[PDB]
RNA sequence: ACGAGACUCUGGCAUGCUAACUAGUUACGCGACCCCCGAGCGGUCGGCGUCCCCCAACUUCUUAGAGGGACAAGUGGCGUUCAGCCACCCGAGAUUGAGCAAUAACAGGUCUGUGAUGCCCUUAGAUGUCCGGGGCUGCACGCGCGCUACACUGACUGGCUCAGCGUGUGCCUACCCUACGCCGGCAGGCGCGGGUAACCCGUUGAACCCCAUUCGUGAUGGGGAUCGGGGAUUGCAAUUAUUCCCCAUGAACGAGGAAUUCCCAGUAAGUGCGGGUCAUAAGCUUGCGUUGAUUAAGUCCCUGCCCUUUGUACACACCGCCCGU
């Protein structure tokens, strides 16, 4: 199997199990109080979202690699409701995004490849496809 | 013309029309019945190109209304398909048969049109062609649904289903059928 | 305007009030429960979540804006 | 009060006037008894040889 | 379940016992949706319990934590009174004691006769907006 | 999203329409094409309708900003 | 002879043509690299976030040159059977949208765009210029274009995936677009590596919308005005708060009277993105794309327009004229 044959919305939840099982990457001292972007009005209801956020950005590296802070901040964006004035687009947080990438470095998941863009190690890909063999084996559309 | 007509969830066949006056306009087998209600975008070119869309498709098109909702079609497709599950649960028979006997039951037989009768432009009761009777009800029933679910807790697939299922056995209860007679009643009051 | 008094709790009397009746409903949705009772959906969606766990009510469609349940084939 | 509700076919469309172009005269026949061709005005699209529903057949509704 | 700890009083400010605990806390002045949502985290309480649930043994934690934010590694940038021209007390503030500060700071403008206070003395717009069309309720 | 769907539902169909000619009989086109066309025209024929330009006056092509009357 | 039409640009579609490392290539060689990553012991398969030189195959998509194509042509009705209309297989069925625009005028705006200018005013205590700080924005009021909502088809939170016009640095002049690594919650900062551009921004991986949790008819978390404290940015100067961030106060408003505007097809309507102003920057405007209806194929009923017949005591022409205590 491969990531390109399974449900992505449940896939990120699946990997959110894995980083809870490893449970040693890092969890920043500020996970309590940050907002995950500059446009939201309320921090996430789920307090264990770092397993979720790091499930996404690591997953997106599998499909559009060479991505740094920007290509991860660009995906994390939506309406920036200034209220009376019309809404807009506003990129997500910078520092919160990179701390994921550094934490993956310690776990050796991702690496900085040529062109200075984060890519994925050949052992790093093993983890991403391995869990795919589990969701696929337990779900047929 | 596939192996058999089917929604994948319901089946189109055996949906009968209780008027000889609404076939060729209540379209359930034009030459077919589409698996999923969503247009190709051809229609609305000549005045009778509008009577070749599936009745479900046009009702899907009329759920978008009143500002914030406008232009969101895939959201209605979700409502309509769910709303047919709900009708099939309360009463049974294929909701097409519910909808068909419902959209019949909400279009008036008459209207009061302005015309010269008594020197000034009066109102003389007139007759309504089949297209204007299917077209009136279809946007009339949405009006009941949109009004009903505007402040209730009820889910939309509930109120729309609850409103239609009244009409197939219409008893002066569904907002559309409440209007339908009142359109005729005032029409017969002046001639 | 007038309150609806949709409460935020149970009382061991209204709860078993629910436990006999609804599995004979052909239409089991969070909306119809709160029409029948003077209860918020939050409890009822949870109460149906409570009742769904027992097995007295079965599943037709669990969707973001609405969920559908039916009878347990009583007869 | 008897309730004669008659079904009927148009044959040709005559004209489309009366208030603002809203109404439409036809010379509708009945389909089931080829009987009195009552010329009545209707409001809305009118196909060629299309069916019609009708409450009371006794107007003639002509150029008033 | 039973009604244990519904509508109550704290900081002399009512609490809407029916709702969730998170936004019930926000019924107090000086506290908002976020400041409520963080102190709940630092008291280690499940957000999914209504206010008629857990008794005073847990809110006794919250009342003190809320009064003194700095003691529990609360990022000071949440705090709404930082580096004040009063004694530099970096602390979240609370019920009507806070409005006292608002009376004080406005008075400070009006005790020294500054620009902003001079407009508050009349009650017109102070942030430098217009009143060509707006200003009438 | 919807634009892509109305593309793939056409490209796939016109793929098999174009395939069956080059290595299979022409009737294999017609037994398929006629069943394809008698169901939906668009699966064979592309949607020509496309967005039209915007005029000054009106946020869209043909709407207008209101007019002020003394 | 003018205006119309004719013409220019634009959109459609041409599996045909000359072509493309600054485009596709992608179909392939599987020349390799990687995960048992699965039916598969394994290969062939599926995938690649990948890696290539041209001694691969080209041009469907990408781009733009010549082409080509549609013309009441084919058929049938209706027509004085001329002009033409209605319908239909064919297909872009003559139908995309604009640019362009005559005769005669208006005491319509502009001397505040101009070294284009008549006359008058004034020219040293300047109505010339330059500098400083202010004002053009001030509040009992009434007005005209507009963004925000009033919520559950909704809001909060998470995942998800898609776009098209352009634009971007040394100019008689002062600063452009921005990847990528670290610091900072964020607003921001510091080394830095590209671009005078189909080259790196940018395979523009935008939003409403698609799938989950929370809220539960309650001024509620809808709404985001007002006010206080804080934190950064551009600048000779932010105070009468340039902007932007953070905490916090949480009002008016329960779908809106009389009136009245805009629209008939990818149009209405929703959402988002460029350009313009721009050292600081849009609630405005000029454009682009996405989501995608209901209601019409008609009439002069209202406000108005073109031609002809008739009427007039009107001619700065009904905003006319004109009568008597």
């Amino acid at each position: 199997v491969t990531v390109k044959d399974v449900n992505q919305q449940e896939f990120v939840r699946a990997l959110a199990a894995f980083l809870k099982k490893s449970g040693k990457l890092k969890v920043p001292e500020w996970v309590d109080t940050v907002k995950l972007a500059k446009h939201k009005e309320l921090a996430p209801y789920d307090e264990n979202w770092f397993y979720t956020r790091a499930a996404s950005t690591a997953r997106h590296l599998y499909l559009r690699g060479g991505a740094g802070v920007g290509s991860m901040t660009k995906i994390y964006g939506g309406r920036q409701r200034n209220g009376v004035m019309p809404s807009h687009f506003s990129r997500g947080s910078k520092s919160v995004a990179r701390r994921v990438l550094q934490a993956l470095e310690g776990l050796k998941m991702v690496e900085k490849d040529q062109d200075w863009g984060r890519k994925l190690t050949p052992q790093g890909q093993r983890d991403l496809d391995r869990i795919a063999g589990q969701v696929a084996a337990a779900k047929k559309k | 013309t596939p192996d058999i007509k089917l929604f994948g969830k319901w089946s189109t066949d055996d949906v009968q029309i209780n008027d000889i006056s609404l076939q060729d306009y209540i379209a359930v087998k034009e030459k077919y019945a589409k698996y999923l209600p969503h247009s190709a975008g051809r229609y609305a070119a000549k005045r009778f190109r509008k009577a070749q869309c599936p009745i479900v498709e046009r009702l899907t098109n009329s759920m978008m209304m009143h500002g914030r909702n406008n232009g969101k079609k895939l959201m209605t497709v979700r409502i309509v398909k769910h709303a047919f599950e709900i009708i099939h649960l309360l009463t049974g028979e294929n909701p097409l048969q519910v909808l068909v006997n419902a959209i019949i039951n909400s279009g008036p037989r008459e209207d009061s049109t302005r015309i010269g009768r008594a020197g000034t432009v009066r109102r003389q009761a007139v007759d309504v062609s089949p297209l204007r009777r299917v077209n009136q009800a279809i946007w009339l029933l949405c009006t009941g649904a949109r009004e009903a679910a505007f402040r209730n807790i009820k889910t939309i697939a509930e109120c729309l289903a609850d409103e239609l299922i009244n009409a197939a056995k219409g008893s002066s209860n569904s907002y559309a059928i409440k209007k339908k007679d009142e359109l005729e009643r005032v029409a017969k009051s002046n001639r | 305007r007038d309150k609806l008094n949709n409460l935020v709790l149970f009382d061991k009397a209204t709860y078993d009030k629910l436990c006999k009746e609804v599995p004979n409903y052909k239409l089991i949705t969070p909306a119809v429960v709160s029409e029948r009772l003077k209860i918020r959906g939050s409890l009822a969606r949870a109460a149906l979540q409570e009742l769904l766990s027992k097995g007295l009510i079965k599943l037709v469609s669990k969707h973001r804006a609405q969920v559908i349940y039916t009878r347990n084939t009583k007869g | 009060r008897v309730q004669p509700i008659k079904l009927a076919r148009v044959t040709k469309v005559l004209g489309r006037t009366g208030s603002q172009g809203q109404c439409t005269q036809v010379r509708v026949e009945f389909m089931d008894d080829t009987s009195r061709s009552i010329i009545r005005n209707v409001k809305g699209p009118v196909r060629e040889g299309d069916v019609l529903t009708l409450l009371e057949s006794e107007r003639e509704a002509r150029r008033l | 379940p039973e009604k244990f700890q519904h509508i109550l009083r704290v900081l002399n400010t009512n609490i809407d016992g029916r709702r969730k605990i998170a936004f019930a806390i926000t019924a107090i002045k000086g506290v908002g949706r976020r400041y409520a949502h963080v102190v709940l985290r630092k008291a280690d309480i499940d957000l999914t319990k209504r206010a008629g649930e857990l008794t005073e043994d847990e809110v006794e934690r919250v009342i003190t934590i809320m009064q003194n934010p700095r003691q529990y590694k609360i990022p000071d940038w949440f705090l709404n009174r930082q580096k004040d021209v009063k004694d530099g007390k970096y602390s979240q503030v609370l019920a009507n004691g806070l409005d006292n500060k608002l009376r004080e700071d406005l008075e400070r403008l009006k005790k020294i006769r500054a620009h902003r206070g001079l407009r508050h003395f009349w009650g017109l717009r102070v942030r430098g907006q217009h009143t060509k069309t707006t200003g009438r309720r | 999203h919807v634009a892509q769907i109305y593309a793939i539902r056409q490209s796939i169909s016109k793929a098999l329409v174009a395939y069956y000619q080059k290595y299979v009989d022409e009737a294999s086109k017609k037994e398929i094409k006629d069943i394809l066309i008698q169901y939906d025209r668009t699966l064979l024929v592309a949607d020509p309708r496309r967005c039209e330009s915007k005029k000054f006056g009106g946020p869209g092509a043909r709407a207008r900003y209101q007019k002020s009357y003394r």
Side-chain angles (χ1 to χ4, degrees):
Chain A
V1 308
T2 302
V3 174
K4 186 179 288 293
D5 309 63
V6 299
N7 301 265
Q8 303 300 319
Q9 74 273 59
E10 161 56 1
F11 203 90
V12 298
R13 179 161 309 155
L15 193 152
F18 184 110
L19 295 175
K20 194 198 83 161
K21 200 70 56 165
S22 305
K24 55 193 177 302
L25 290 72
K26 180 261 291 181
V27 295
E29 189 179 32
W30 60 87
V31 293
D32 295 357
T33 61
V34 296
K35 186 183 286 186
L36 191 149
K38 70 165 214 153
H39 49 53
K40 312 171 61 52
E41 62 157 351
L42 184 64
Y45 291 159
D46 185 76
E47 181 72 350
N48 290 318
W49 60 258
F50 204 100
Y51 315 97
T52 300
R53 179 160 158 106
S56 82
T57 76
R59 192 191 71 85
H60 286 164
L61 277 174
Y62 189 75
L63 277 296
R64 49 190 194 121
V69 186
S71 281
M72 299 317 198
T73 57
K74 292 179 48 136
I75 192 42
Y76 284 0
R79 292 172 177 191
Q80 193 251 356
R81 188 147 60 193
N82 196 23
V84 163
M85 283 172 239
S87 296
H88 298 95
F89 181 33
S90 287
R91 293 180 181 177
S93 62
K94 288 186 73 172
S95 190
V96 176
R98 60 156 67 105
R99 298 312 306 236
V100 169
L101 277 297
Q102 304 214 40
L104 301 203
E105 290 184 353
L107 186 144
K108 93 172 299 295
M109 182 36 48
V110 309
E111 41 175 59
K112 226 145 322 212
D113 233 296
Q114 100 294 6
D115 312 327
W116 323 155
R118 314 310 246 89
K119 300 215 164 99
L120 183 62
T121 73
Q123 310 164 1
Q125 303 224 340
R126 179 261 197 294
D127 287 325
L128 268 297
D129 313 298
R130 165 170 45 84
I131 190 168
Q134 273 203 100
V135 173
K139 177 54 167 56
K140 188 180 197 306
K141 192 71 169 67
Chain B
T1 312
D3 291 330
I4 193 49
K5 308 299 185 185
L6 183 63
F7 293 98
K9 59 200 81 61
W10 321 136
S11 178
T12 288
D13 193 8
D14 201 329
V15 167
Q16 310 280 60
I17 297 90
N18 294 27
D19 297 73
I20 191 178
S21 174
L22 279 152
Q23 304 149 262
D24 195 326
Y25 303 91
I26 297 198
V28 67
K29 296 165 290 301
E30 315 86 15
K31 292 181 291 299
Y32 38 74
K34 305 292 196 177
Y35 278 82
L36 194 155
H38 188 273
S39 173
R42 287 274 158 204
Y43 318 90
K46 284 195 182 50
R47 68 197 303 211
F48 306 130
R49 186 70 181 98
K50 205 170 308 303
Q52 303 219 63
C53 283
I55 301 300
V56 191
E57 175 75 34
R58 295 172 52 198
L59 176 50
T60 303
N61 274 7
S62 168
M63 294 299 291
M64 294 182 286
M65 215 84 87
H66 291 88
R68 52 191 148 73
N69 284 39
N70 204 347
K72 297 170 194 174
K73 178 154 180 167
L74 294 189
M75 202 185 218
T76 61
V77 174
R78 185 190 57 56
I79 297 195
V80 167
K81 283 195 162 312
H82 281 217
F84 287 167
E85 281 188 354
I86 297 196
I87 297 175
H88 167 281
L89 296 185
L90 285 170
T91 312
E93 280 184 356
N94 193 340
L96 321 182
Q97 281 285 109
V98 164
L99 171 69
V100 161
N101 310 341
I103 191 169
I104 297 178
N105 271 287
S106 292
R109 264 84 171 154
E110 272 185 9
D111 281 328
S112 66
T113 300
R114 271 269 287 294
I115 191 186
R117 185 193 64 88
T120 55
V121 287
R122 285 282 186 183
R123 292 141 70 89
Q124 280 217 283
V126 301
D127 169 349
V128 286
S129 88
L131 202 54
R132 179 89 167 123
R133 185 179 67 189
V134 63
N135 279 351
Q136 259 181 308
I138 190 186
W139 84 266
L140 198 59
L141 58 82
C142 292
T143 295
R146 213 157 299 121
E147 168 178 354
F150 183 64
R151 308 287 311 107
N152 294 177
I153 57 85
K154 290 192 287 184
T155 61
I156 297 182
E158 185 71 25
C159 59
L160 167 58
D162 207 300
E163 173 200 300
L164 278 165
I165 193 48
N166 281 296
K169 56 193 187 299
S171 316
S172 300
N173 50 349
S174 185
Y175 166 75
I177 297 197
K178 189 179 289 185
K179 288 300 191 255
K180 175 188 80 178
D181 60 65
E182 277 209 11
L183 276 62
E184 309 152 74
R185 289 151 79 267
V186 183
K188 191 130 80 184
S189 160
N190 61 350
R191 286 193 178 182
Chain C
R1 292 157 64 175
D2 287 320
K3 187 59 163 50
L4 292 178
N5 278 335
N6 284 340
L7 73 165
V8 293
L9 59 86
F10 283 161
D11 294 77
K12 192 52 178 175
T14 44
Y15 169 73
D16 284 354
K17 180 67 173 66
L18 179 67
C19 282
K20 279 288 190 307
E21 305 172 8
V22 296
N24 284 327
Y25 272 133
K26 297 210 150 155
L27 191 147
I28 297 180
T29 188
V32 74
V33 175
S34 66
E35 291 276 290
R36 182 190 47 83
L37 285 182
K38 300 304 186 307
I39 190 185
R40 318 191 180 208
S42 178
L43 281 70
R45 171 177 83 255
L48 288 169
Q49 268 188 349
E50 280 176 353
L51 294 175
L52 183 63
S53 307
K54 314 322 171 283
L56 279 75
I57 297 94
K58 73 177 180 65
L59 174 46
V60 164
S61 66
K62 189 267 287 182
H63 163 261
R64 44 181 281 171
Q66 189 202 6
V67 298
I68 297 186
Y69 323 112
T70 69
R71 292 165 45 192
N72 203 355
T73 314
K74 303 283 184 176
Chain D
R1 175 73 82 173
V2 67
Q3 317 88 345
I5 310 308
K6 304 332 291 193
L7 272 293
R9 66 178 64 88
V10 303
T11 62
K12 64 192 311 313
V13 59
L14 280 294
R16 195 201 210 211
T17 187
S19 71
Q20 278 103 305
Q22 182 44 11
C23 318
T24 309
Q25 281 105 24
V26 298
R27 65 181 180 179
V28 58
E29 301 263 16
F30 281 153
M31 307 171 143
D32 205 358
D33 291 331
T34 298
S35 199
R36 53 168 185 262
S37 60
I38 301 300
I39 297 169
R40 318 184 73 200
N41 54 6
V42 310
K43 63 165 312 162
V46 177
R47 225 169 172 170
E48 271 277 329
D50 72 324
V51 177
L52 188 152
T53 311
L54 187 145
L55 291 178
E56 185 204 359
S57 59
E58 282 326 290
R59 283 210 212 101
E60 293 293 329
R62 176 66 181 192
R63 295 303 154 84
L64 177 44
Chain E
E2 206 260 337
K3 175 187 176 92
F4 314 103
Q5 291 282 333
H6 288 278
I7 297 193
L8 59 89
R9 205 140 156 77
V10 66
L11 271 299
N12 311 124
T13 300
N14 220 359
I15 301 297
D16 295 331
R18 263 80 49 81
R19 59 191 307 120
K20 279 278 171 322
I21 62 178
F23 312 90
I25 297 175
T26 62
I28 298 139
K29 308 194 70 141
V31 65
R33 188 183 301 102
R34 291 185 61 188
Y35 188 62
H37 270 71
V38 65
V39 289
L40 273 192
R41 181 56 43 191
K42 282 163 176 250
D44 306 335
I45 297 175
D46 304 78
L47 282 70
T48 43
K49 298 163 306 211
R50 294 268 167 175
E53 295 210 14
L54 61 84
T55 74
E56 296 192 11
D57 302 332
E58 293 82 3
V59 299
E60 181 66 90
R61 287 140 83 154
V62 166
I63 297 157
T64 61
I65 297 170
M66 179 180 299
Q67 284 185 346
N68 303 6
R70 182 159 264 152
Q71 58 186 9
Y72 263 80
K73 294 192 221 63
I74 297 183
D76 287 345
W77 61 271
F78 282 1
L79 314 185
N80 47 286
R81 291 283 293 200
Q82 305 176 48
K83 213 185 176 180
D84 295 336
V85 288
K86 70 191 291 289
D87 43 352
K89 199 71 187 78
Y90 282 62
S91 188
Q92 183 86 44
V93 182
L94 290 156
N96 194 37
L98 170 59
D99 291 331
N100 296 114
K101 310 290 179 302
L102 303 205
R103 304 143 66 248
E104 293 179 353
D105 281 324
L106 269 76
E107 172 46 89
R108 173 173 61 86
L109 310 167
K110 297 175 277 182
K111 191 183 187 299
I112 191 168
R113 310 308 163 141
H115 188 61
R116 292 247 301 288
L118 190 41
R119 305 266 148 153
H120 295 285
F121 185 75
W122 305 315
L124 72 164
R125 286 291 209 278
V126 291
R127 284 190 172 183
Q129 292 73 80
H130 302 171
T131 308
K132 280 300 281 293
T133 300
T134 60
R136 295 156 267 193
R137 290 303 169 192
Chain F
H1 285 158
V2 162
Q4 308 200 24
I5 297 176
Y6 276 77
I8 62 186
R9 65 179 293 204
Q10 184 178 182
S11 86
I12 297 172
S13 179
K14 197 146 53 175
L16 186 149
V17 175
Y19 185 84
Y20 263 120
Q21 189 275 331
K22 271 300 188 319
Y23 304 74
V24 190
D25 62 282
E26 273 272 317
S28 292
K29 277 198 140 159
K30 75 171 295 305
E31 301 146 80
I32 297 177
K33 190 175 283 183
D34 269 313
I35 297 192
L36 275 181
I37 190 181
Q38 296 294 321
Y39 191 91
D40 177 63
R41 177 174 153 72
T42 307
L43 301 191
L44 295 173
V45 185
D47 284 300
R49 52 187 159 291
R50 300 187 59 247
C51 278
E52 66 183 1
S53 175
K54 158 187 166 302
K55 277 77 173 172
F56 64 81
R62 301 210 217 151
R64 273 312 170 287
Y65 316 109
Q66 283 154 220
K67 274 171 50 173
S68 65
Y69 281 178
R70 190 181 77 181

